[PDB]
Amino acid sequence: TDLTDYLNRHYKAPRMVLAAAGGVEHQQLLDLAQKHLSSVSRVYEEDAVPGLTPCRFTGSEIRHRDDALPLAHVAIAVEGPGWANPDNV
Amino acid sequence: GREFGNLARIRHVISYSLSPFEQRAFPSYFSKGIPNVLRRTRERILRVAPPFVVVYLIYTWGNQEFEQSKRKNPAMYEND
């Protein structure tokens, strides 16, 4: 039932892209999407729309010490700009 | 010979820390500082204080005994 609720909540048609690359015709793919992929859900069934929430970045540290391992892996990061900010480039 | 890297063998221990710019320097300073200081002083006061208490008693007794040692004895100059 948790899987059914997740499937009915997050597999909405406006949040879906049917992408094709290579030897495909766009009109044939559009006709096939009209034939098969039409009317997925389009409705959240309770007018309960989820919203994306910003995430707080925290300068912090986690150290998992286990001296029996032969090699050590260390990652150091700072906050990134996001997808839509052009200075990513 | 004795530096970071070869001090001890530690397995399966996870440490979590945060930036000093992320947290307060005085997080509930008085409201948790007062009971912690009270707990430390009530765990150590019976071991520490009674020697200094009897030093105070010995000091006062010695000073007053020296003061009455300098006091004139009235038993003298009584026969004549």
Ligand SMILES: CCCCCCCCCCCCCCCCCC(=O)OC[C@H](COP(=O)(O)OCCN)OC(=O)CCCCCCCCCCCCCCCCC
């Ligand atoms: C029998 C203990 C009964 C304790 C009752 C109190 C309640 C206990 C239960 C509730 C908890 C309260 C808080 C507890 C704090 C830590 C625990 C504690 O205080 O334990 C008692 C402490 C240690 O006990 P312990 O070392 O086993 O006793 C041997 C005594 N020699 O022992 C003490 O603090 C006693 C210290 C006595 C020191 C007397 C010193 C006299 C002589 C001083 C001479 C100084 C120099 C004089 C001049 C010399 C030259 C002329």
